[PDB]
Amino acid sequence: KWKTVSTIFLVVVLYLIIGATVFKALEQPQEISQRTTIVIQREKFLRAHPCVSDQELDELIQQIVAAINAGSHWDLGSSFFFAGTVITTIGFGNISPRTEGGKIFCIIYALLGIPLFGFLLAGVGDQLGTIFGKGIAKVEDTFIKWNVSQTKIRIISTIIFILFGCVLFVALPAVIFKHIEGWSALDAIYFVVITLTTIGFGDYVAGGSYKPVVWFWILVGLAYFAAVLSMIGDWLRVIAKKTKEAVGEFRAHAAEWTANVTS
Amino acid sequence: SDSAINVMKWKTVSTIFLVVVLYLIIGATVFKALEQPQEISQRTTIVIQREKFLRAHPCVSDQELDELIQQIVAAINAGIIPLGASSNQVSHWDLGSSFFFAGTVITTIGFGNISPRTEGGKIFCIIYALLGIPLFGFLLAGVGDQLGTIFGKGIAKVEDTFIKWNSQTKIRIISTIIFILFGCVLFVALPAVIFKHIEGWSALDAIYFVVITLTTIGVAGGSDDFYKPVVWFWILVGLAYFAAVLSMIGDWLRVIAKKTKEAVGEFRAHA
Numbered sequence: 001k002w003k004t005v006s007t008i009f010l011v012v013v014l015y016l017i018i019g020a021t022v023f024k025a026l027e028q029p030q031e032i033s034q035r036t037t038i039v040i041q042r043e044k045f046l047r048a049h050p051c052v053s054d055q056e057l058d059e060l061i062q063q064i065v066a067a068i069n070a071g072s073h074w075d076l077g078s079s080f081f082f083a084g085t086v087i088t089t090i091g092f093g094n095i096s097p098r099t100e101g102g103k104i105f106c107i108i109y110a111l112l113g114i115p116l117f118g119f120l121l122a123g124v125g126d127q128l129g130t131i132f133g134k135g136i137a138k139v140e141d142t143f144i145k146w147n148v149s150q151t152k153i154r155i156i157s158t159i160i161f162i163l164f165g166c167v168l169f170v171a172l173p174a175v176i177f178k179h180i181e182g183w184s185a186l187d188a189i190y191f192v193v194i195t196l197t198t199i200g201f202g203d204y205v206a207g208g209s210y211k212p213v214v215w216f217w218i219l220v221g222l223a224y225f226a227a228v229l230s231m232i233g234d235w236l237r238v239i240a241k242k243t244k245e246a247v248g249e250f251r252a253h254a255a256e257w258t259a260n261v262t263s
Numbered sequence: 264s265d266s267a268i269n270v271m272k273w274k275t276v277s278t279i280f281l282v283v284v285l286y287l288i289i290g291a292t293v294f295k296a297l298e299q300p301q302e303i304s305q306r307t308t309i310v311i312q313r314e315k316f317l318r319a320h321p322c323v324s325d326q327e328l329d330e331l332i333q334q335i336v337a338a339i340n341a342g343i344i345p346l347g348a349s350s351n352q353v354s355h356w357d358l359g360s361s362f363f364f365a366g367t368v369i370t371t372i373g374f375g376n377i378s379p380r381t382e383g384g385k386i387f388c389i390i391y392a393l394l395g396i397p398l399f400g401f402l403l404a405g406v407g408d409q410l411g412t413i414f415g416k417g418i419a420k421v422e423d424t425f426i427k428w429n430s431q432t433k434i435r436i437i438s439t440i441i442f443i444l445f446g447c448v449l450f451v452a453l454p455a456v457i458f459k460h461i462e463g464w465s466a467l468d469a470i471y472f473v474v475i476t477l478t479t480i481g482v483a484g485g486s487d488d489f490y491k492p493v494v495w496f497w498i499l500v501g502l503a504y505f506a507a508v509l510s511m512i513g514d515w516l517r518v519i520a521k522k523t524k525e526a527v528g529e530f531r532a533h534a
């Protein structure tokens with residue numbers, strides 16, 4: 001009977017409206033600086049070469065925008081990586097199928113590969129969850145009868161989870177993907193979160209300016225954030241009830257307050 | 264007995280791992296047999312237009328022409344209309360696009376081609392996703408249950424208008440067909456038919472769009488403002504629809520797993 005979904009719907013709508021104003025307050029500034037200087041390279045290029053004219057630079061952009069549709073890809077291994085992005089729903093989509101048969105196959109290949117891969121990820125999650133269960137069984141005997149109480153013991157372990165998990169999964173896999181002479185510090189964490197949350201794989205680089213072991217870290221990392229996101233959902237559930245009781249309690253005191261004023 | 268079921272679980276996981284490995288190898292060979300031919304025809308003819316347009320203007324910087332193309336392709340990763348006509352441009356981080364961007368983040372659909380460049384935008388996006396993805400899941404789960412009872416009501420009338428004389432175990436299969444029928448007509452067919460008249464997508468390219476989107480794999484939004492809010496709410500319920508569809512397909516694979524798991528066991532035993 002009681003819906004309770006529309007209230008969550010409004011929070012999500014409100015959460016998006018906040019996120020909207022924040023992203024445009026962080027990205028629209030740099031959007032101007034780029035796109036004002038892009039005019040500068042176009043204004044400089046026609047001056048640097050009277051050989052090429054206005055009518056001809058548009059033709060080049062057209063022929064480069066036409067090349068966006070294509071970009072050797074689809075080789076023995078690239079189509080393997082593509083199929084991995086499909087069943088993991090990461091789907092970076094820089095190289096997407098252009099053939100009618102390739103799209104029809106991709107529809108069926110996804111409708112069957114996504115559930116199939118789900119059983120793998122679920123089994124890897126349980127398999128890795130017990131590995132973590134053994135790792136805490138030794139930690140939950142050598143530190144428990146000490147002074148840290150029942151409600152606090154649970155928190156030290158969750159810190160050891162986040163630190164030992166995230167430090168592994170932001171340092172090694174992002175680099176094990178492209179492993180030496182590492183990277184910018186932030187774009188490794190940004191790469192990992194965007195990838196393992198199945199959001200879309202932050203910008204493959206080929207250095208213009210391993211197969212079982214790499215998909216190991218991916219499969220373990222996807223299972224890692226699968227639990228990480230699920231815990232965050234649990235902490236949101238707690239904070240939901242803690243804020244549910246606070247309002248109904250404040251609305252309870254403000255109600256009898258108003259009755260006292262009517263005297 | 265405690266770690267005896269785990270001796271039995273690890274066997275089941277690695278076999279599913281091998282199925283996934285082989286499933287990717289099959290998929291790999293199928294895509295590269297369908298797409299790599301069209302790639303050769305494209306790259307051989309894109310060299311022709313370099314060999315054409317560079318002989319058509321020898322006075323352009325030959326060795327530096329590739330550097331211009333890189334700097335143009337590097338600009339493609341961001342929003343660009345770098346042309347002599349229409350130097351005026353529109354922001355892809357405007358009032359409504361960054362709203363759509365946040366939607367692709369919490370739904371994990373993802374980014375189209377453009378992603379945040381600012382360090383502050385990347386740090387916020389990490390926090391926004393780690394909190395937005397779980398938040399959205401509660402909505403999607405509530406939408407699924409809210410939609411599941413609407414289906415439970417719609418099937419309650421259908422499961423009485425066909426109750427003749429004589430079973431319980433068989434009516435459940437008719438109910439799953441009327442799910443896929445109404446479901447794929449409402450959530451896959453009707454919107455795919457509507458996108459034909461808006462962006463001119465071929466018949467397949469609309470279904471392919473719906474599947475890739477609502478299976479959160481990852482554009483009709485640009486038209487160059489009355490239907491984007493409606494489509495967004497189609498997406499929310501369509502995401503809840505494929506959530507169950509993918510879940511059923513997984514259950515169908517559990518059945519097909521055991522039926523083949525028992526078939527090999529008997530064929531090995533009797534022979």
Ligand SMILES: CCCCCCCO[C@@H]1O[C@H](CO)[C@@H](O)[C@H](O)[C@H]1O
Pocket residue numbers: 179180181182
């Ligand atoms: C600049 C300070 C770097 C602090 C870390 C010191 C170790 O460097 C790393 O050594 C690794 C090989 O063992 C390689 O991955 C890279 O050559 C390098 O990244």
Ligand SMILES: CCCCCCCO[C@@H]1O[C@H](CO)[C@@H](O)[C@H](O)[C@H]1O
Pocket residue numbers: 176179180
């Ligand atoms: C147990 C997992 C072992 C995985 C091996 C990964 C291969 O990377 C190597 O591992 C070293 C740290 O281990 C790095 O410092 C080196 O840069 C690199 O040569």
Ligand SMILES: CCCCCCCCCCCCCCCC
Pocket residue numbers: 011015018019243244247248
């Ligand atoms: C980017 C972070 C967004 C934070 C949004 C906080 C919204 C809080 C909603 C408060 C309303 C809850 C109503 C509960 C009624 C019982």
Ligand SMILES: CCCCCCCCCCCC
Pocket residue numbers: 104107108111466467
């Ligand atoms: C115009 C042709 C469209 C063909 C669509 C085929 C869909 C296949 C569904 C497979 C379900 C597992």
Ligand SMILES: CCCCCCCCCCCC
Pocket residue numbers: 011236239240243394
């Ligand atoms: C940093 C705070 C982010 C928002 C966390 C709470 C969002 C939901 C609370 C209300 C749920 C009913």
Ligand SMILES: CCCCCCCCCCCC
Pocket residue numbers: 282285286289523527
């Ligand atoms: C594209 C579908 C691939 C199907 C592969 C079937 C593999 C079954 C192996 C049976 C082992 C018991």
Ligand SMILES: CCCCCCCCCC
Pocket residue numbers: 382383384386387
């Ligand atoms: C380098 C600038 C960091 C900006 C972080 C913005 C966080 C906003 C949280 C509401």
Ligand SMILES: CCCCCCCC
Pocket residue numbers: 282516519520523
């Ligand atoms: C129908 C293709 C998947 C194979 C099902 C059997 C998995 C053990």
Ligand SMILES: [K+]
Pocket residue numbers: 089198479
């Ligand atoms: K998913």
Ligand SMILES: [K+]
Pocket residue numbers: 088089090197198199370371372478479480
């Ligand atoms: K996804």
Ligand SMILES: [K+]
Pocket residue numbers: 089090091092198199200371372373479480481
């Ligand atoms: K995605």
